[PDB]
């Protein structure tokens, strides 16, 4: 039978403040839940922005973490389609197969939980967690930072059982994101003439995905040149530093594209560049995918004029992939070498170091830290 | 050969005054320009817009005018395609054929005489205008508030000489933009949940193309109820009027289309209700499109988030259609009744009250207002 498991993980008993490493509690898994045993997780700016405390929707204690990859130890009743030892990757955009959004081809975005999941709960209301008497909140449905999590059944994803864990576990987020915003929002077209503001591991995704999209320009845009290289390595064929140019990024894009481009991508999070991305796009028909997340009240804005005369801005959520029946095929894509993801591990550290891992996010020395569990 | 033509205009001497008929001489066709006899016109926002002078790029003296029906009375050297009595509607938006927006299927937005146009003058650099030894200039290369015009033999469209002058002058702007936000712009489903803001003709075409498209609910939105029972007649299956709730209209569409609608339309110009029309689109697949040119200087704005859960912002000034291919067409999908213009038509005046056309537009009791020259 399915006991209590003590084990390790990275608690965040309050915000502002480092990870704590904690011995809790890890209850079974209920009705439809599966419990995972982490193998390998990594950091991403959306659980800095959390522990930081910024984040008007964040509480606390909770266990943070969304990029994992790890193996089934145990389901509970009712789930037929996961059993222990299956290799797996938890999801925070989850697949239930039956409502709305998961039944329309336009959309990925599953509701079945995410009420719960807003409030670090599962299904049934109640976390799984508990440590030094208190109880620990889930994070994004998924909460990789530790041992063992428990996650609903429908937030996992059944992978090649060859996989790397210690690779794949980035295709949790990021690297999906960019790659989907270009094959899957965007839908560009072989010989489409991209700009990519950002070039961290999503901006570099997304060139990725306008390669093999088979975009013919390709434009990385970014404040710091260190980042330059690596983003040509993935296909962009010129980088640019707004901070060169006394004229806005988007004029300086228009002149070099006599006109402006046809895709643009913006992965960086900040709304003056979302709006310089959209402007910075061919008249009649430019098109802007926003893939950085904005933080809370900030607004974008332009003169409806740019939309009018034909432009199109969009966003983007995980890349638009239905999760469930997607992320193994991402896998196989990676196993096939038809997409990267080992060029996007530029750190690997120990759990008890996952401090390091945000630090290094901070300094932007980084793209991708792989921490092993 | 062609002389000069002494004929009556309405000439706009300065911003903010009403229109005079004035006696006018008209120029002979240079190469390639076509002079055409304006049977029918009718005014729009945009022509008021320019006269209230609060367009910076407005310029007097000048011919107003874009919406017109008429016969080639004669053309320039180099024209072969045109001829004297061919049945035309002069377009704001040309199609050359040839340059780099005419031969991408996406826009149809020709840029070959817009320097000149926005100048109001010929592709020449000149004006054909002259009166009381002034120079007046042309207007959206149409000028149709004068007996006989001019324009480049790129901006006619060739039309059913069948067809009846005194309603087809209303495809030149309005119903095609409304029509074509609907089949071209949105391209929505059989099925689909639509909002259309704004009832007057831009808001009723748009409604006559979701119609004709197939959707399942056309929700009519108007601060005037008088609107309502016409929008109904075109198809409309609810309508509802902003005034009669407390909250929010984009509150008040999502919860009787559980969710949002799957497109909707802002057929106003008003940049609080085009924010308003994107936050009242489905999650994950909802699609918004600000339908027709609007006043410069105001911006649109909203939280990214808005575009990263699923929704896509769009627009059209003339509804997509390549204009010298397509306005023929448009004229027979009228002749053949598959689309409406006569019950577009609440007014008829003589070229002599056109400034009662101005007036019936901005008092809100007319839909469109058809003048005899
Ligand atoms: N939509 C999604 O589903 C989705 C998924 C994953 C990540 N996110 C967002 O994607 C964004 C990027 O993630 P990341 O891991 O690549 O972050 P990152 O910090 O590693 O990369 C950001 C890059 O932007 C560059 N940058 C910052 N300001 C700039 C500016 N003004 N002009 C040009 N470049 C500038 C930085 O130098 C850095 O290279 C974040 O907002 C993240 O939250 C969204
Ligand atoms: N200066 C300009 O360039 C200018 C000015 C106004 C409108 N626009 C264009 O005018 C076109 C509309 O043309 P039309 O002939 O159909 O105009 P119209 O004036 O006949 O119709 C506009 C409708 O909007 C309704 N309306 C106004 N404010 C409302 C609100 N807050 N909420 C809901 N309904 C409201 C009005 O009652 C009217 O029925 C659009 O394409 C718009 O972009 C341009
Ligand atoms: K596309
Ligand atoms: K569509
Ligand atoms: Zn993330
Ligand atoms: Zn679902
Ligand atoms: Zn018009
Ligand atoms: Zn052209």
């Given at each position: 039978a399915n006991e209590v498991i003590k084990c390790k993980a990275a608690v965040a008993?309050?915000?502002g403040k480092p990870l704590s490493i904690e011995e809790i509690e890890v209850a079974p898994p209920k009705a439809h839940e599966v419990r995972i045993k982490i193998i390998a997780t990594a950091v991403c700016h959306t659980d800095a922005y959390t522990l930081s405390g910024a984040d008007p929707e964040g509480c606390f204690p909770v266990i943070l973490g969304h990029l994992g990859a790890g193996i089934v130890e145990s389901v509970g009743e009712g789930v037929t389609k996961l059993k222990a030892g299956d290799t797996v990757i938890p999801l925070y955009?989850?697949?239930?197969?039956?409502?709305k959004f998961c039944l329309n081809?336009?959309?990925?975005?599953?509701?079945?939980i995410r009420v719960t999941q807003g409030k670090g709960l599962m299904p049934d209301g109640t976390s799984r967690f508990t440590c030094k008497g208190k109880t620990i909140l889930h994070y994004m449905?998924?909460?990789?930072?530790?041992?063992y999590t428990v996650v609903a059944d429908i937030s996992v994803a059944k992978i090649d059982p060859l996989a790397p864990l210690d690779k794949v576990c980035?295709?949790?987020?990021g690297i999906s994101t960019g790659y989907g915003a270009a094959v899957?929002?965007?839908?560009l077209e072989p010989g489409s003439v991209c700009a990519v503001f950002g070039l961290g591991g999503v901006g570099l995704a997304v060139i990725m995905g306008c390669k093999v999209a088979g975009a013919s320009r390709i434009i990385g845009v970014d404040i710091?040149?260190?980042?330059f290289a690596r983003a040509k390595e993935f296909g962009a064929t010129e980088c640019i530093n707004?901070?060169?140019?006394?004229?806005?990024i988007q004029e300086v894009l228009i002149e070099m594209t006599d006109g402006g481009v046809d895709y643009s991508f913006e992965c960086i999070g900040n709304v003056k560049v979302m709006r310089a991305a959209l402007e910075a796009c061919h008249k009649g028909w430019g098109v802007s995918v926003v893939v950085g997340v904005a933080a809370s009240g900030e607004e974008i804005a332009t003169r409806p004029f740019q939309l009018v005369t034909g432009r199109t801005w969009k966003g983007t959520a995980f890349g638009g992939w239905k999760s469930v029946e997607s992320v193994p095929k991402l896998v196989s894509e990676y196993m096939s070498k038809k997409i990267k993801v080992?060029?996007?591990?530029t750190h690997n550290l120990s759990f008890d170091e996952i401090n390091k891992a945000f630090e290094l996010m901070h300094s932007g020395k980084s793209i991708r830290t792989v921490v092993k569990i």
């Open positions: 008993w309050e915000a955009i989850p697949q239930c197969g039956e409502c081809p336009k959309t990925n975005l599953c509701q079945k449905g998924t909460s990789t930072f530790s041992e980035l295709l949790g987020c899957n929002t965007a839908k710091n040149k260190d980042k707004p901070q060169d140019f006394s004229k806005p080992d060029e996007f591990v």
